[PDB]
């Protein structure tokens, strides 16, 4: 319907795509680095989610330049996506309040 709802939907789909690609790319970037732990896909996908939500427990993280670059993309995609949802909620509340005031 409205632009904000559409944008929020698209952002969520975009995020899921970034989570999957980031998981795949993180493993590709980290294998070959002695000591790295972000090296199998199941846990890499878990890592991508706790990174996108900015929780970052510290159980897993990248040690290489390219793994870190991948991490930044996931971080920004998560922060932006969740932020966009907040903006969509605000727009919805603002429209409803204008109606309620009879504006």
């Amino acid at each position, epitope marked *: 319907s409205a632009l904000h709802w559409r944008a929020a939907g698209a952002a969520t789909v975009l995020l899921v795509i970034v989570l999957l690609a980031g998981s*795949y790319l993180a493993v590709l970037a980290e294998r*070959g680095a002695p000591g790295a732990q972000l090296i*199998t*896909y199941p846990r890499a996908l878990w890592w991508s989610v706790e990174t996108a939500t900015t929780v970052g427990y510290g159980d897993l993280y990248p040690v290489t330049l390219w793994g870190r670059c991948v991490a930044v993309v996931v971080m920004v995609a998560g922060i932006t996506s969740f932020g966009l949802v907040t903006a969509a909620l605000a727009t919805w509340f603002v429209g409803r309040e204008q109606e309620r005031r009879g504006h």
Partner: antibody, heavy 118, light 108 residues
Framework: QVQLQQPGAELVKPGASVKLSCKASGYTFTSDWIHWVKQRPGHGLEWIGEIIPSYGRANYNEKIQKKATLTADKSSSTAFMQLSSLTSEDSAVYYC???????????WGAGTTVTVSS | DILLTQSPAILSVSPGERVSFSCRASQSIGTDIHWYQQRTNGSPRLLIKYASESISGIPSRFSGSGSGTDFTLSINSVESEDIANYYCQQSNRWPFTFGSGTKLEIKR
């Protein structure tokens, strides 16, 4: 059916090189990695390296002298290992194994016995 | 690189008795340990994954346990076909590494 097919043997003259092959069957995923393991007679298993066919990137064991170069042919679903300038120290059984990106070697090839002799 | 220590190198047991193989990691690796069986002239065969997960087609007398640095592969009532070399392998940190292996011998 046999998931990984490797030739039974290869005779190599000292100083020369050889190209081992590992043909894969069964399910193939973008997350699959093909590994190579070396086993000298009477000795244990030694990891040589790995390659991800979907991207073509390979990594190698840093603890040993690099004698191998890994490549893969996506169309023929075959992984290759080029061993160069071999010595008698390189005589052994070389296995290829498939890992689904989750850390363990689910299936192994029969192994190729490489003998370095004149 | 993670060092996996398997000791003793040879384990002797009487037929039907329970036996346990030891694998110790140089640092804590959760449950990222896998076990393989290799008979004379054969290729390694996956027995247990992630320390204790059973694999389809593997006899029920095989089980694994442990976490952190100490792991164990156990065989309930060992039999002739169990005669082989057993290796542990870790996938917690790059690169993957193998233990030196332990041989099982039966006293008949």
């Amino acid at each position: 059916q046999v998931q990984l097919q490797q030739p039974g043997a290869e005779l190599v003259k000292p100083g020369a090189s050889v190209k081992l092959s590992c043909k894969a069957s069964g399910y193939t995923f973008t997350s699959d990695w093909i590994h190579w393991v070396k086993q000298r007679p009477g000795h244990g298993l030694e990891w040589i390296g790995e390659i991800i066919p979907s991207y073509g990137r390979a990594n190698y064991n840093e603890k040993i002298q690099k004698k191998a170069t890994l490549t893969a042919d996506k169309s023929s679903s075959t992984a290759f290992m080029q061993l160069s300038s071999l010595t008698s120290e390189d005589s052994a059984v070389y296995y290829c194994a498939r890992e689904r990106g989750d850390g363990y070697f689910a299936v192994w090839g029969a192994g190729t016995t490489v003998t370095v002799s004149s | 690189d993670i060092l996996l220590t398997q000791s003793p190198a040879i384990l002797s047991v009487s037929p039907g008795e329970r036996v346990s193989f030891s694998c110790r990691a140089s640092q804590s690796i959760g449950t990222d340990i896998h076990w393989y069986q290799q008979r004379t002239n054969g290729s390694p065969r996956l027995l247990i994954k992630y320390a204790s997960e059973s694999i389809s087609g593997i006899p029920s007398r095989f089980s694994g346990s442990g976490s952190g640095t100490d792991f164990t592969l156990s065989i309930n009532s060992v039999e002739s076909e169990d005669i082989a070399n057993y290796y542990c392998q870790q996938s917690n940190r790059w690169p993957f590494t193998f233990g030196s292996g332990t041989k099982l011998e039966i006293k008949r």
